[PDB]
Paper text:
The KCNH family of voltage gated potassium channels includes the EAG (ether-a-go-go) channels, the ERG (eag related gene) channels and the ELK (eag like K+) channels; these channels have roles in cardiac repolarization, neuronal excitability, cell differentiation and tumor growth. A defining characteristic of KCNH channels is their large N- and C-terminal cytoplasmic regions. The N-terminus typically includes a Per-Arnt-Sim (PAS) domain, while the C-terminal region includes a domain that strongly resembles cyclic nucleotide binding domains, but which has been shown to have little affinity for cyclic nucleotides. As already stated, the role of PAS domains in KCNH channels is unknown; it is not known if these domains bind small ligands or mediate interactions between the channel and other proteins.
Crystals of mEAG PAS domain were obtained by removing the first 26 residues of the domain, which correspond to the disordered region detected in the hERG PAS structure. The asymmetric unit cell of mEAG PAS domain crystals contains four copies which, excluding the N- and C-termini, are very similar to each other (rmsd for main-chain atoms of residues 28 to132 varying between 0.2 and 0.6 Å). In contrast to dELK, all four structures in the asymmetric unit of the mEAG PAS domain show cavities that overlap with the one detected in hERG. The high resolution mEAG domain structures reveal multiple conformations for some side-chains, in particular in residues surrounding the cavity (S65, T86, I97, F109 and V111). Strikingly, the volume of the cavity in the mEAG PAS domain varies among the different models generated, from a minimum of ∼111 Å3 to a maximum of ∼136 Å3; the largest cavity has as maximum dimensions ∼8 6.5 6 Å. Only the conformers of V111 have any effect on the cavity properties, the remainder of the variation comes from adjustments in main-chain atoms. Unlike in hERG, the cavity in mEAG is isolated from the bulk solvent by a lid formed by a tyrosine side-chain (Y71); this residue occupies the same position as H70 in hERG (at the mouth of the cavity) but its larger side-chain occludes the opening. The residues that line the cavity defined in each conformer model vary but, in general, the polar face is determined by main-chain carbonyl groups from residues S65 and A66, as well as by the hydroxyl of the side-chain from Y71 and thiol groups from C67 and C128. The apolar face is formed by side-chains of apolar residues: V83, F87, I97, M99, V111, I113, and F130.
Residue numbers in the entry: 25 to 137
Amino acid sequence: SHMTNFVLGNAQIVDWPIVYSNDGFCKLSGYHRAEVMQKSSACSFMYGELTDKDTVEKVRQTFENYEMNSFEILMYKKNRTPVWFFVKIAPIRNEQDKVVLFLCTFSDITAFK
């Protein structure tokens, strides 16, 4: 399922703001739900020096183009600890086939990277 840690982003507003974050994501990221809500579901609030900038660009284009893609990406927990995440980005469509949300699912792959 990989539903341990996830957020939902609003596909129909610029920057795809997070409209839901589960307890797992808050724990994994180090950020309280209050701090995550309305941030970009691209999670650029977690990017930093070591984050691969080509990967950041591919992640942006995935949202921009309403695509389904997944990435390994070096991000930073709230306390500045660097962590390798596996991130899956998946558009969610309504019954009229319009993309309304993005489901973004995350796991820590630091141990295996």
